[PDB]
Amino acid sequence: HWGYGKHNGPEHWHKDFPIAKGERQSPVDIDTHTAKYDPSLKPLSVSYDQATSLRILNNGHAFNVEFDDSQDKAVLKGGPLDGTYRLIQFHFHWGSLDGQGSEHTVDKKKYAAELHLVHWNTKYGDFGKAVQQPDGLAVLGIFLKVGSAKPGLQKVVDVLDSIKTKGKSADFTNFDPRGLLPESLDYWTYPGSLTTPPLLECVTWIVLKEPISVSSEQVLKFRKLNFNGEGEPEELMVDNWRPAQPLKNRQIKASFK
Template identity: 25%
Template sequence: MCNKGRRQSPINVEPDKLLFDPYLRPLHIDKHKVSGTLHNTGQSLVFRVDKDTKQHVNISGGPLAYRYQFEEIYIHYGTENSQGSEHHIQGYSFPGEIQLYGFNKELYHNMSEAQHKSQGIVGISLMVQIGDTPNPELRIITSTFNKVLYRVVRIETIDARLRANT
């Protein structure tokens, strides 16, 4: 669908066009700590889980029919409070956006194999607002931002329990 101009990124979510699903289950993300590396791509920061991680973080539930193994986090942010997110909601750009990506571990062996296949990859976007209450799990990553200006930084553990206010 992407090569036909559908399901493209970035998108503008229009709330008045969304359909309510009363049977939608809660999204579940395992609560394991993982190690990885934080890269500066020049456009965003990317955290990649180490290949030799023993306990994987799985994403399931919600609209997902399969279990997906978490592999990467893309972090988009700007210098202005209202600019930074890749996606928009009703034309509004958020100060930041966290995108979690995983591959379908029930059908495929890794992200490379799954990326061009049906039901292969899941992407979850969390829009970031600036608030008064700090998030300790998010702080693990953001505290290293000043160290990735021009190089890769190793993060020993990241807690997969990034909390979102609902």
């Protein structure tokens, strides 16, 4: 099965998922000098006040904080998007070292980690149908740098001991994802894909320019998770990022000058 090892990592994925070599794969390097300011892009609307978190899950490649997406409780609209996209989950990608971990890069710079807030287009009725459409998902990507702690991340960090291994879940109610946002909503946007198998080309990526700061202790706790299940040999959950893919025939647009 796929993973992030030498024998099953990103360079192998194309054998089971040939779309790995497709025309709109993610992540990509964001060349800030060639990204085009698009003055017709709208401000993003992030409406998370009624968000209902439910659970946190170690799925063997990351941990997902899951939300009730059975109503328009936490939605992303505006920006490059047409219509309303509902928050279903968030997760992170991170490194073994502070110098790597992000999936997107900025002028080839790698951040320590990257947060993905995943939303699906309500016109398709549910997530499974949405991922079969070219405009099915909107993923808000936020870079993490190591410095001062992010207070709003700590509740996540503190529950990780209860989901150390693959397949473990825990209740995770009343978590406010607003506490994970930077001050500015300036962004880059481009059409792309899931960054994990099945690598479906269904994502409008919205990557924020401003990183959030997390502490060394916070990201160290991410690195204590396991890819393996309980009672299997311990494999630390680190370097669960796909490297940048060819931009091909795409333009990255900026919401800001």
